[PDB]
Amino acid sequence: GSSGSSGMVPCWNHGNITRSKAEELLSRTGKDGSFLVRASESISRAYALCVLYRNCVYTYRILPNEDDKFTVQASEGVSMRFFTKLDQLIEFYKKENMGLVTHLQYPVPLEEEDTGDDP
């Protein structure tokens, strides 16, 4: 029950993680422009985009389309685009005044053990 792809990969695409985690990470940064993605527990075919703002985590469910395309089911059905790739969907939502609470400022890094000796 694993997966993967060949080629460089972003940092905002954490992966299969629990809710507590989604927020946990954001908290660390504490910036009014943090964001991240994860695999929806309920349905794998779908994703979950978390956006921090004014100390509030706004999760966004991404259900697949007839053409296996990832499209945020936020808006009703007028101001919504359709992308086949995940990254291609995120970037697009980099601008403000779209649908999310805040515009993706910096792709919050994963939670890996970092041990730096010298400054």
UniProtKB/Swiss-Prot annotation:
Specifically expressed in immune and hematopoietic cells. Expressed in bone marrow and blood cells. Levels vary considerably within this compartment. Present in at least 74% of immature CD34+ cells, whereas within the more mature population of CD33+ cells, it is present in only 10% of cells. Present in the majority of T-cells, while it is present in a minority of B-cells (at protein level). Tyrosine phosphorylated by the members of the SRC family after exposure to a diverse array of extracellular stimuli such as cytokines, growth factors, antibodies, chemokines, integrin ligands and hypertonic and oxidative stress. Phosphorylated upon IgG receptor FCGR2B-binding. It comes from the Eukaryota. Residues 12-108 form the SH2 domain. Residues 110-119 have a biased composition (Acidic residues). It is found in: Cytoplasm; Cell membrane; Membrane raft; Cytoplasm, Cytoskeleton. Phosphatidylinositol (PtdIns) phosphatase that specifically hydrolyzes the 5-phosphate of phosphatidylinositol-3,4,5-trisphosphate (PtdIns(3,4,5)P3) to produce PtdIns(3,4)P2, thereby negatively regulating the PI3K (phosphoinositide 3-kinase) pathways. Able also to hydrolyzes the 5-phosphate of phosphatidylinositol-4,5-bisphosphate (PtdIns(4,5)P3) and inositol 1,3,4,5-tetrakisphosphate. Acts as a negative regulator of B-cell antigen receptor signaling. Belongs to the inositol 1,4,5-trisphosphate 5-phosphatase family. Interacts with tyrosine phosphorylated form of SHC1. Interacts with tyrosine phosphorylated form of DOK1. Interacts with tyrosine phosphorylated form of DOK3. Interacts with tyrosine phosphorylated form of SLAMF1/CD150. Interacts with PTPN11 in response to IL-3. Interacts with receptor EPOR. Interacts with receptors MS4A2/FCER1B and FCER1G. Interacts with receptors FCGR2B and FCGR3. Interacts with receptor FCGR2A, leading to regulate gene expression during the phagocytic process. Interacts with GRB2. Interacts with PLCG1. Interacts with tyrosine kinases SRC and TEC. Interacts with c-Met/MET. The SH2 domain interacts with tyrosine phosphorylated forms of proteins such as SHC1 or PTPN11/SHP-2. It competes with that of GRB2 for binding to phosphorylated SHC1 to inhibit the Ras pathway. It is also required for tyrosine phosphorylation. The NPXY sequence motif found in many tyrosine-phosphorylated proteins is required for the specific binding of the PID domain. This is Phosphatidylinositol 3,4,5-trisphosphate 5-phosphatase 1. The lineage of its organism: Eukaryota, Metazoa, Chordata, Craniata, Vertebrata. The chain holds residues 1 to 112 of 1189 of the full protein.
